[PDB]
Amino acid sequence: NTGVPGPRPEVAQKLSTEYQGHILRMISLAESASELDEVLWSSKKHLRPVHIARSCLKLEYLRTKEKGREVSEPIKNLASELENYVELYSTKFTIGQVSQLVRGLSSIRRNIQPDLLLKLAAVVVADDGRQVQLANEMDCRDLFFGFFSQGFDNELFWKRLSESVLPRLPYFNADVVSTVLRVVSGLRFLHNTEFAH
RNA sequence: UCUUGUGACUUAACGUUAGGGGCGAUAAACCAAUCACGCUAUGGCAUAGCUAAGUUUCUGCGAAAUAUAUUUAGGUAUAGCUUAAAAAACUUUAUAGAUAAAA
Ligand SMILES: [Mg+2]
């Protein structure tokens, strides 16, 4: 934390404490779904949108070792429990946090309720796509693949996102451009358009 | 062994002054076997935060010697001590980009 004036007060006025780092470390230290469940049970009353967003990615990391078997039972239970927090904080997420929520829940082959997806999509539909700029390159590639995997088909959502990302396409990394290209080929309403070209 | 031994002497009988007192060539001396207030009865089973003592058996539980205040310091009061696998809570501190399902 710093009090020096600067060009970006949005990312400089954020308050960072030791207690938040303590909880985030515990989540990352968990080595199994059983351990992660106990960590979340102890911290029930001290979970915030940042913690919820990070936990969803943890499920993705934990299931990578279970390459052969299907999704384990404790992983499914954690996903259901987390969704209760997502609904509670549906209007208190940032574009970066929403980006990693969808990716985490999509990697477990889980489907989000249509009402919840509509609420989360407001991050890019509101403020005429201003919040898209705040998102960095890593956030953008997860937004495209995450929402595409969820089966979310909304012309207004995809039209606004495409317009706000078009200027930055030439300067993204090659892999990120490839990810966007695959998503476009899967959506009929984006074929043979300026965005595709 | 020593002092005085006709004198401010010694002795016998009876009498006078009484304790908030008497008497005293003053030693606080004497006033019925030891007086800086006699003896006896009563108030009176005076008062003692001090010392001593406290009488048959069996079963169960079980301390303290610190703090504060005190005409208080070897007394007493208050607090402390002793008797009388539930619920709830998450604590010894700081951080990432790992998924690829469609001719
Ligand atoms: Mg004298």
Ligand SMILES: [Mg+2]
């Ligand atoms: Mg005992």
Ligand SMILES: [Mg+2]
């Ligand atoms: Mg006084």
